[PDB]
Amino acid sequence: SPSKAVIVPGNGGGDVTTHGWYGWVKKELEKIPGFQCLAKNMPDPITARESIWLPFMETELHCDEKTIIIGHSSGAIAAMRYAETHRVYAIVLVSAYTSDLGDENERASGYFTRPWQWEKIKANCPYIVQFGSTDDPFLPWKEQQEVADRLETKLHKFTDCGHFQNTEFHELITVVKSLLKVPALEHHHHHH
């Protein structure tokens, strides 16, 4: 049973409470009786180092087996790596990808220095939902598709949402509410 949602933003100095759609979503989720939504500015906001973000997610955002982690861009990457070694109720990935995109700041994060442990993630997180747009100026659809295929995510594919940098996100609320009802699990494939 999920007790809270935690928002892990993409990299950048923007204050999480007033940048992008994080704040609006947090307020909408807080309208749900008995629910909570945590969103805090991340340590090392620019480079989003894995060695910094994951420990923060564990002790400061208290990401556990009763948490729905909503990760955006770098935050989606962080949630995926987090799920390789931690059990989580669900992860909602917004604008996920798989490589450093040949970008030095992405490489500096340390998230892409080795292959993705897809099966471990799939085993540690029963519900993986994904939002992605084919017109994302930052990411090649191929990589968003790779995440969808390897994690067998429930994909919400759009064509005009870019990198999801608007201020409201109703569809995300609908997803979180569906997760709170604990939907029936779909037939997936787990391997060694």
Swiss-Prot record:
Residues 61-65 are annotated as: Involved in binding to RB1. GO terms for cellular component: nucleoplasm. Changing residue 73 to A: Loss of serine hydrolase activity. Fails to block TGF-beta-mediated anti-proliferative signal in tumor cells. Keywords: Hydrolase. It comes from the Eukaryota. SUPFAM superfamilies: alpha/beta-Hydrolases. One of its GO terms (molecular function) is serine hydrolase activity. It catalyses: valacyclovir + H2O = acyclovir + L-valine + H(+). It is an enzyme of class 3 (hydrolase). The keyword Transmembrane helix does not apply. InterPro entries: AB_hydrolase_fold (IPR029058), Hydrolase_RBBP9/YdeN (IPR010662), RBBP9 (IPR052581). Its EC number is 3.1.-.-. Belongs to the RBBP9 family. Plays a role in maintaining pluripotency in human stem cells in vitro. Serine hydrolase. Catalyzes the hydrolytic activation of amino acid ester of the antiviral prodrug valacyclovir to its corresponding active drug, acyclovir. May negatively regulate basal or autocrine TGF-beta signaling by suppressing SMAD2-SMAD3 phosphorylation. May play a role in the transformation process due to its capacity to confer resistance to the growth-inhibitory effects of TGF-beta through interaction with RB1 and the subsequent displacement of E2F1. This is Serine hydrolase RBBP9. It comes from Homo sapiens (Human). The gene is RBBP9.
